[PDB]
């Protein structure tokens, strides 16, 4: 009667980097919702954190979540490459003067 | 017959449009509006949210145009937010457009009476109770109160007795405008209702209850 699953239940919602991420979404595209986190950046962060991209955001265990937070907050420490991370009015006035000059000729 | 405040025996259906926001202001006197006059109402120091005489106009259009009023079983009263009580003749055919209505009310508030050539609209002396029928049920429209079927409510009501409703013409406010006059407050629907809808609902129920058709 007493069965307790070690990994834990499915998390419908999670809080990462002061952002709410839906559990139903995949890990990469759920992390994309964080500002400053793009598709490729989230994919790379998951690859560094060693999290299977096929999992759902809710499926993530705890230690993977702290690992993702740590990679994101200190990208250089884990070798994330650096590359990854009036005059016009004067022209307009000249144009208006020229247009007035043409109107003068015609 | 045209029901009038003097008659107290006939069973009728009185509607009191409480907290009606009708006022005149001169920079010339003109009915105040939430949109036409915004700065002016700021100068008077009031909120522009509760500056809406259109609510009182829409209620009158639906009340006067209802089949019951055509049957001579309804008379309306307006309790202005300032405490000015106005009696509306059931026979009146108020202007349909609002601008012509605003011109009519501003004539009313100064001349204190509109006459045709019976006063179609006449300012009267408060309290409302003196004018209401001697035997009458008083209720208010409350969202928090229990919901009731208007057809059943009027049916279980007596025959010699009449029904008063104090519909709140304010945009927003506490439903305590008519608390001291009234004996109970009743809810009419689970969803919050506009003033025009509420009196139209309570109008439709009376017509089914009394077989006005």
């Amino acid at each position: 009667s007493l069965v307790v699953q070690e990994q834990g239940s499915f998390q419908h919602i999670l809080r990462l980097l002061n952002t709410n991420v839906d559990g139903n979404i995949k890990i990469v595209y759920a992390l994309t919702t964080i500002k400053g986190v793009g598709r490729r950046y989230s994919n790379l962060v998951c690859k560094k954190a060693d999290v299977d991209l096929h999992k759902r955001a809710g499926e993530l265990t705890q230690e993977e979540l702290e690992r993702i937070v740590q990679i994101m907050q200190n990208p250089t420490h884990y070798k994330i490459p650096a590359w990854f991370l009036t005059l016009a009015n004067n022209v307009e006035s000249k144009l208006r003067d020229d247009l007035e000059r043409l109107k003068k000729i015609r | 017959p045209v029901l009038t405040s003097k008659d107290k025996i006939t069973k009728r259906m009185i509607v009191v449009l409480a907290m009606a926001s009708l006022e005149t202001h001169k920079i010339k006197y003109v009915l105040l509006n939430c949109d036409d006059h915004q700065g002016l109402l700021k100068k008077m120091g009031r909120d522009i949210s509760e500056a809406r005489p259109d609510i009182t106009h829409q209620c009158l259009l639906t009340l006067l145009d209802s089949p019951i009023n055509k049957a001579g079983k309804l008379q309306v009263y307006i309790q202005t937010s300032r405490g000015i009580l106005i009696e509306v003749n059931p026979t009146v055919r108020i202007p349909r457009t609002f601008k012509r209505f605003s011109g009519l009310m501003v004539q009313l508030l100064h001349k204190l009476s509109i006459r045709s050539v019976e006063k179609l609209l006449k300012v009267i002396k408060n309290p409302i109770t003196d004018h209401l029928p001697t035997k009458c049920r008083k209720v208010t429209l409350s969202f928090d109160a229990p919901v009731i079927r208007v057809q059943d409510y009027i049916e279980k009501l007596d025959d010699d007795e009449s029904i008063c409703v104090f519909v709140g013409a304010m945009a927003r406010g506490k439903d305590n405008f008519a608390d001291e006059y009234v004996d109970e407050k009743v809810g009419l629907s689970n969803y919050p209702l506009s003033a025009s809808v509420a009196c139209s609902k309570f109008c439709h129920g009376a017509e089914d209850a009394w077989n006005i058709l």
Partner: protein
């Protein structure tokens, strides 16, 4: 347990339904056994949780508000237990002093002539100096 829909009254229900509902009310008896030791046999699922309703009248304002949650829709997925477990009478008093919102102290317009009873108005009948 928090609510039995069969006992709710609908304004559209017919007079016979009203009569049927009334009879159902008269015959109800709480089946929860407090002495049964088997949790699978206590018939609790057929009972109702009147006790949590009474807690909505608890003297402490914040405990009453928590109890009121059962009257509100169950939007929250779960409640963090760790934020409610280790509370004491001392913590409640300390939390009361360190209140974010500060209010004005009120006074009683009703007047009592004597605080204690004798051995016009007495605040504590049954107690004497």
């Amino acid at each position: 347990m928090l609510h039995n829909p069969a006992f709710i009254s609908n304004p559209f229900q017919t007079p016979d339904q009203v009569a049927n509902l009334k009879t159902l009310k008269e015959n109800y008896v709480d089946p929860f056994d407090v002495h049964e030791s088997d949790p699978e046999l206590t018939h609790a699922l057929d009972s109702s949780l009147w006790e949590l309703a009474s807690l909505m009248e608890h003297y402490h304002p914040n405990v009453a508000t928590l109890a009121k949650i059962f009257a509100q829709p169950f939007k929250k997925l779960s409640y963090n237990m760790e934020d409610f477990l280790d509370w004491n009478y001392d913590s409640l008093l300390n939390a009361e002093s360190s209140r974010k919102l500060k209010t004005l102290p009120t006074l009683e317009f009703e007047a009592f002539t004597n605080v204690f009873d004798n051995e016009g108005n007495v605040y504590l009948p049954g107690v004497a100096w």
